[PDB]
């Protein structure tokens, strides 16, 4: 019948940069979770607050599918309560998160000889992100006392840096694609269920 567009998310051709991550809303359909966990094609697969086995027995009002690309040594920051540049400045998860975090290596897709410098990450911010914040401001960061007024310089850094994924890098520095499924059920009626 009307299946949930998970292929749209995991099998998409374009992935966003982590600082400007992309959120897909999923509702009014039936989702086969078994297609996900029954697969070792994934390198990380951790669910928080529910067990994936018990997923087909539950119904939700929304599933949000946030997806972005970071290097592999940072996938360990896509968890509740983690710290580091990715966790604090790009994608924060909340202390009480109910969802899953699925990642797989994509060196053969996101590396180009000489470097894929099209993937960015935020490096500076004056404060941590709030959970599920998404901050795309390109305002010059004042690291000193000099107001920077849209001009880079001494103590005046542009807050996004590039990744530069080369196919030769060690695995800690290869690009990984990440999807983060949130299983929210608000004060709506449950509209995202599993099969028979």
């Amino acid at each position, epitope marked *: 019948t009307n299946l949930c567009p998970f292929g749209e998310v995991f099998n998409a051709t374009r992935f966003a940069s982590v600082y400007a991550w992309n959120r897909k809303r999923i509702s009014n359909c039936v989702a086969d979770y078994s297609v996900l*966990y029954n697969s070792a094609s994934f390198s990380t697969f951790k*669910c928080y607050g529910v067990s994936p086995t018990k997923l087909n027995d539950l119904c939700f009002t929304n599933v949000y599918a946030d997806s972005f690309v970071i290097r592999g040594d940072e996938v360990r920051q896509i968890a509740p309560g983690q710290t580091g540049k990715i966790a604090d400045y790009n994608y924060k998860l909340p*202390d*009480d998160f109910t969802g899953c975090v699925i990642a797989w290596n994509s060196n053969n897709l996101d590396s180009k000889v000489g470097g894929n410098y099209n993937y960015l990450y935020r490096l500076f911010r004056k404060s941590n992100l709030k959970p599920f914040e998404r901050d795309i401001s390109t305002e010059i960061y004042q690291a000193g006392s000099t107001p920077c007024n849209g001009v880079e310089g001494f103590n005046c850094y542009f807050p996004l840096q590039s990744y530069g994924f080369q196919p030769t890098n060690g695995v800690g520095y290869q690009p990984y694609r990440v999807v983060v499924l949130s299983f929210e059920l608000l004060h709506a009626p449950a509209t995202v269920c599993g099969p028979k």
Partner: antibody, heavy 129, light 108 residues
């Protein structure tokens, strides 16, 4: 930032009951995906795990110390606390509370509570008269 | 019950030196090992988790490696701030046990 403060009696006396609590700041024990735990370290000696507890109440204890202790949570004050029974001279220590990393399920459904991610400053407790 | 043996017990070394501490696990513990540092009079600080991952804000000279039953922590270039006691801990299953601790003294 998450921080953790210990509160405890300066001393107790032999064969009595020892009690310490930990008041969590900058994050809420309620509904949070972390086990919260207690670790003791007698003076000059190494660390020993005592037990850890989820917000729900579910616990894990060190087998060697289970039965002399029970820890519990007051989700409403945002604190958890340890009660250690029939104290010996041995149990003189610094008592540490800690926040685990976020607990998760793997692809197959197996549960992991993880490592001690953050530590309190520790409260020394002397068994004495 | 898994029991951890850490060697050496103590350790003298000069600044700029490289030092490696060893943790042996009586049974396989996959990569579920963490390394903690404890400067005098403070709480332990997590250095390494999942055997080899470095916690944020920990110096880049700290590195851990190992899997199964033999693990190491390695301070690439000793610093005087690195005077501490180092403990390893297995977090496989729900029986948690530490090492006896390696005390690192600075030769001067």
């Amino acid at each position: 930032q998450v921080q953790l403060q210990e509160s405890g009696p300066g001393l107790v006396k032999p064969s009595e009951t020892l009690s310490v609590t930990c008041t969590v700041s900058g994050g809420s024990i309620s509904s949070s995906r972390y086990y919260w735990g207690w670790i003791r370290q007698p003076p000059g000696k190494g660390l020993e795990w005592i037990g850890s507890i989820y917000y729900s109440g579910s616990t894990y204890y060190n087998p060697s110390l289970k039965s002399r202790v029970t820890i519990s949570v007051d989700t409403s004050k945002n604190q958890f606390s340890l009660k250690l029974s029939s104290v010996t001279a041995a149990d003189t220590a610094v008592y540490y509370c800690a926040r685990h990393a976020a607990a998760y399920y793997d692809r197959s459904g197996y549960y992991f509570i993880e490592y001690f991610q953050h530590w309190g400053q520790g409260t020394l407790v002397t068994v004495s008269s | 019950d898994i029991q951890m043996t850490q060697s050496p017990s103590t350790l003298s070394a000069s600044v700029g030196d490289s030092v490696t501490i060893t943790c042996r696990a009586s049974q396989s513990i996959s990569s579920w090992l963490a390394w903690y540092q404890q400067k005098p009079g403070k709480a332990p600080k997590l250095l390494i988790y999942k055997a080899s991952s470095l916690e944020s804000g920990v110096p880049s000279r700290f590195s851990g490696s190992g899997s199964g039953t033999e693990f190491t922590l390695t301070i690439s270039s000793l610093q005087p701030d690195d005077f501490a006691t180092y403990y390893c801990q297995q977090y496989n299953n729900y029986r948690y046990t530490f090492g006896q601790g390696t005390k690192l003294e600075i030769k001067r």
